[PDB]
Each structure stands twice: as structure tokens, then as C-alpha cells.
Design an enzyme around this catalytic site. Sequence first.
Site, PDB file in Angstrom:
ATOM      1  N   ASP B  25      32.896  63.905 -45.020  1.00  0.00           N
ATOM      2  CA  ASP B  25      31.934  62.903 -45.477  1.00  0.00           C
ATOM      3  C   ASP B  25      31.958  61.670 -44.579  1.00  0.00           C
ATOM      4  OD1 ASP B  25      30.190  61.315 -46.774  1.00  0.00           O
ATOM      5  OD2 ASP B  25      31.185  61.394 -48.738  1.00  0.00           O
ATOM      6  N   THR B  26      30.977  61.580 -43.677  1.00  0.00           N
ATOM      7  CA  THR B  26      30.849  60.431 -42.792  1.00  0.00           C
ATOM      8  C   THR B  26      30.428  59.165 -43.526  1.00  0.00           C
ATOM      9  OG1 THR B  26      28.543  60.969 -42.249  1.00  0.00           O
ATOM     10  CG2 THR B  26      30.270  61.963 -40.888  1.00  0.00           C
ATOM     11  N   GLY B  27      29.974  59.274 -44.771  1.00  0.00           N
ATOM     12  CA  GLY B  27      29.578  58.126 -45.555  1.00  0.00           C
ATOM     13  C   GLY B  27      30.687  57.480 -46.350  1.00  0.00           C
TER      14      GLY B  27
END
EC number: 3.4.23.16
Lengths: 99, 99
Positions: B25-27
Site C-alpha cells: 500500500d503506497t498510500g
Amino acid sequence: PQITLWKRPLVTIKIGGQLKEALLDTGADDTVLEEMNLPGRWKPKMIGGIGGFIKVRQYDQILIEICGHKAIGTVLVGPTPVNVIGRNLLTQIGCTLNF
Amino acid sequence: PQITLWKRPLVTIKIGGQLKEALLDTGADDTVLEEMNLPGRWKPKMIGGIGGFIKVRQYDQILIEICGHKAIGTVLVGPTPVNVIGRNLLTQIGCTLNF
Ligand SMILES: CC(C)CN(C[C@@H](O)[C@H](Cc1ccccc1)NC(=O)O[C@H]1CO[C@H]2OCC[C@H]21)S(=O)(=O)c1ccc([C@@H](O)CO)cc1
């Protein structure tokens, strides 16, 4: 581009003719933007995140440009803490995770 | 490897002697794991996302193996509906976004 992750992957987007900053978010199925005026019809929907569910305005088939790459798809508008670009649009600009 | 985003970027991880499925998850700034009884000291924390905030326990210097890539850093444990591998560990396995 190849984007490293030591910083938040924030990028400039264009939607409704307006520029904005948004987070490339591989953990989001959908794209959720903060309150804004968007032209066209919309339908009310609910989306769930880490802390619960919020009401959003669903806009279908919306033109959105992400770091110079065009996409056309669903954009949810509501009280999100951050503008997030989800997988529905990340796939359109050809975005992949690599390691 | 290269992971497309047609479907959720779920991978197998090893933490606390357990195997789990988690999102790349890059967020997420930090890694957030579903409730589990890890030993050792922790510090209370509040993290906010869509829907509001949840209370989590912050554990430091936790070893996590992500697709055979070893990492060590901060892990937040709480009532999250999904395990998410955040940027604090994605950088350690050499993960980039590419388009
Ligand atoms: C909203 C982002 C800015 C932040 N989040 C990461 C996102 O990827 C989140 C992951 C997720 C995926 C499924 C269920 C619950 C959560 N996806 C998400 O909400 O997606 C929505 C829209 O599309 C749908 O698909 C899935 C749900 C719907 S977070 O988990 O809340 C968060 C907040 C603070 C920290 C600290 O470390 C500081 O960052 C770390 C992580």
C-alpha cells in the site's frame, strides 16, 4: 516515471479543468477526492475505509489526467482526508508495483 | 517481480511467527496489521483515514518478511479490516511505482 517511496507519492492531477495534488494509493480500490464542484450527473454512494464509512458523490466516466497520463473513470467525491488515486485509474495509466 | 493493479496487490508476509496476507500500500506511511498479540512494549497511536480514526498499538523494530524480502521497522496493530504494508517497509524491499 519510476517513483521511490521514501516520500509520499504525491502527483499533480487535472480534473474538471482544475489542477490538484493527489496520492497514488495502491491500497485503494477507488479514487476518492475532497469536496469539489464537478460538472455532470452523480449518484450517492457509500465507501468504507480504515475508520468507517462515508457518504460520497459518485461521478462516472470522468476525464482525469495524472502526471501527464489521461484516464477516464469513476471518481468519488466526499470527506476523505486526502485526495487518493485508486487502482481503477492506476491501471489506466499503466501503473505497476515493482521490486 | 512486477505486480499489476487489476486486483488488490495482496502478498504473503511473515511476522511474529505467523503467515498473513497483506496489501502493498503506497498510500500508507506506516504498516498497519490486523489485531494480533505481539510481545514486547508498545506506544498508543491514532491513525486516520476514510471514515475517521482508529486506535492502534505501535511496535518498533519488528521483523517482517515480504515475499522473501526481509524488513524491520514500525508496525501498527489495531482493528483494521486489512493488513497493509506501508512505505516504511516498502522502501526496505526496494518497491517502486512505475508507469
Ligand atoms: C486513505 C489513505 C490516505 C490512507 N489509507 C491507506 C489506503 O490505501 C487505504 C487502505 C485500506 C484498504 C481497505 C480497507 C481499509 C483501509 N485504502 C482505502 O481507504 O481505500 C478506500 C477507497 O477505495 C476502497 O478500496 C479500499 C477501501 C476503500 S489508511 O488505511 O486509512 C492509513 C491511514 C494512516 C496511516 C499512517 O501510517 C499515516 O499514513 C496508514 C494507513
